[PDB]
Amino acid sequence: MDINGGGATLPQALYQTSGVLTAGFAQYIGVGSGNGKAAFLNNDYTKFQAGVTNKNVHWAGSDSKLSATELSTYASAKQPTWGKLIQVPSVGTSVAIPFNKSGSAAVDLSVQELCGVFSGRINTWDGISGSGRTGPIVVVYRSESSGTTELFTRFLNAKCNAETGNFAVTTTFGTSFSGGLPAGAVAATGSQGVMTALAAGDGRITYMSPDFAAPTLAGLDDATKVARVGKNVATNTQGVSPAAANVSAAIGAVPVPAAADRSNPDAWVPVFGPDNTAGVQPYPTSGYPILGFTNLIFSQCYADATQTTQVRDFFTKHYGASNNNDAAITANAFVPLPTAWKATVRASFLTASNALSIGNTNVCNGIGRPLLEAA
Numbered sequence: 001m002d003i004n005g006g007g008a009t010l011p012q013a014l015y016q017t018s019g020v021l022t023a024g025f026a027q028y029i030g031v032g033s034g035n036g037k038a039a040f041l042n043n044d045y046t047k048f049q050a051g052v053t054n055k056n057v058h059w060a061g062s063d064s065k066l067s068a069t070e071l072s073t074y075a076s077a078k079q080p081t082w083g084k085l086i087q088v089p090s091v092g093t094s095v096a097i098p099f100n101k102s103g104s105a106a107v108d109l110s111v112q113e114l115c116g117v118f119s120g121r122i123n124t125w126d127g128i129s130g131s132g133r134t135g136p137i138v139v140v141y142r143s144e145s146s147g148t149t150e151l152f153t154r155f156l157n158a159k160c161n162a163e164t165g166n167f168a169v170t171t172t173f174g175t176s177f178s179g180g181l182p183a184g185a186v187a188a189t190g191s192q193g194v195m196t197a198l199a200a201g202d203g204r205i206t207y208m209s210p211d212f213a214a215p216t217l218a219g220l221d222d223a224t225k226v227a228r229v230g231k232n233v234a235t236n237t238q239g240v241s242p243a244a245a246n247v248s249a250a251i252g253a254v255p256v257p258a259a260a261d262r263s264n265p266d267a268w269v270p271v272f273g274p275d276n277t278a279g280v281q282p283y284p285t286s287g288y289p290i291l292g293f294t295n296l297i298f299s300q301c302y303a304d305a306t307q308t309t310q311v312r313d314f315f316t317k318h319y320g321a322s323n324n325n326d327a328a329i330t331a332n333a334f335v336p337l338p339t340a341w342k343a344t345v346r347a348s349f350l351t352a353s354n355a356l357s358i359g360n361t362n363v364c365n366g367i368g369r370p371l372l373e374a375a
Contacts, residue, residue, distance in 0.1 A: 001371055002026040003310055006048040007036015007060035008147050009191040010209035011091065011294045014332040015061060020325050022317050024310035028061065032190065034145020034171055036060035040085075040297050041074050043369065056373050058307065061090070063147025063294040064171050065269050082369045083301030084356070087265035088345055089293040090318070092251030092335030095152050096213035096220060096242035097227040097290075099205040100198050101125055105132030106223035108239040110231040111289065115160035117205060119167075120182030125203060129233060136184070140197050140206040141173040143187035149173045151292040152207040158274045158283060210242050210333035217243070217333055230289055240288050244335050247291040250284035251335040256344045263356065269295050294334075300349075300358055301368030308359040308368070312350060315358065319345045 005015070006029030015021055015028035029048045031039075039047035040060040046053060066074075066087055074085055097114065099107065109117070109128065116122035117137060125133035142149050153176045156167035165179030174181055186204070188197040191212040198204045205227075214220050220243045230239035240246045254270045261267035272292055273280030283289050296318075302308040318325050319342045326336040337345075348356040355363060 001304065001307065002055075003058045003307055003314075004045065004048065004055050005029070005057075005059040005061065006031055006039060007297075008033045008063045008294055009212075010063050010093065010148050011061055011211070011332070011334065012191075013211050014091070014325075014328060014334060017328045017332065020318075020328050022310065022314045024307070025314065030190065032142075032144045033060075033062040033064040033147030033150070036062050037064065037066065037070060037297065041070055041078070043078075045373070053375060054373055056370060058299070058302070058311070058369065060297040061294065062297055063093075063292070064145070064150045065271065065295070066265060066297070068266075071265060081367055083299050083364055083367050084263075085265055086296075086298045086300055086349055086356070086358070088268050088296050088298075088349065089270065089337060089341070090296045091294055091329050091337065092244075092247060092254075093151070093292060093294055093333075094210045094242035094244065094247045094288055095148065095155070095290040095292070096208050096210045097205065097229060098195070098198060098208050098213040098225060099203075099227060100201075100225075101133050101135075101203050101205075103132045103224060105130065106228060107131050107133070108223060108228040108231040110233070110239070111159050111229065112162060113231070114229060115156060115163060118156060118182075118207075119160065119163045119165065119177050119179065120185075121163060123182060129231075136203050137182075138201060138204045139182045139185040140188055140194050140204050141181070141185060142194060143174070143189045145171040146173070147171065147294065148191065148207060148209055149176070152290065154272055154292065155283065155290045158272070159289075210244065213242065213333075217331075220333065242288050242290070244330065244333050246288035247284075248335045250287060250291055251293075252338050253284075254281055254341075256341055262348055269293060298358070299369045300356065300360070301364035302359070302371075303368040304371040307371070308364070312358050315346070315350055319350070 009030040012030030035047045039057045188194045228239035
């Protein structure tokens, strides 16, 4: 009885790379982070495959953090019989800004231009300085509850202080900005669906997984297709590309989860946010500025012993010091976690004596998510 996961589309090509998921894992199903969280929290496989009810959900990928309500509801309704959920970072990621507007000149957005494009204040390619381009801008955004939206709106919320309105942190872009969507904005579903829409009319721009924002990794450095971010004309400063190398130092500087807080799943997912605000990492001053984590949601406990062992073997690979998934992570435009981070994940969720460890024979005694599906 295969282990079923799915959710976030941002990293789906990583989880679909041969060998990244270990024995017993079904192929990952990309449906969006909102759908992934709902699939896991409610054990609702229809959130993975519409119309299919004869399988259980064992894990999810999400780039949206579990909310206080999601966590409390699971704790009261499910944890007594299924065990604690586990929420852990998988990889670090940039958020790229691909666009469809030809021209040899490099497109390099200042942060304030980025803000203005996504608020609708800047609605022509003329309004991006040095762009070599003219004509209308059409914003494409995610129709559904998206972790890419969450990662991106965290940045807009932290940086966009000079609009006619404010950006809220959300999974639904269509309501992020208090002043509405830009006129003419186009909604699409999934990372891939947005990329298809980006190509379906001239002058379109979006926010996107770095794995989908260009067909090849080097394409992230093609500023005729993927905008640089961080221009400051006053200082004669160029922006840079969303290549993983331009966010890796910042990812690597993020503190491991605080020891005393490790029983709280919320404590495990670092988020970036406003400057000089405890609890959130400031966006980096160097390199590429728009980044965050994509995460995994598992149970500590599975009723079935084989499924439990299979989940542990995946963690042993994904968080291993050796024989790990880091090459595949890089190949999909993402940032591996550092040694210390991997060691911290293992210490809590693998090492047997830890109260948090998957399959702990005391904690998980008699409990766990169920083998058989029953409706």
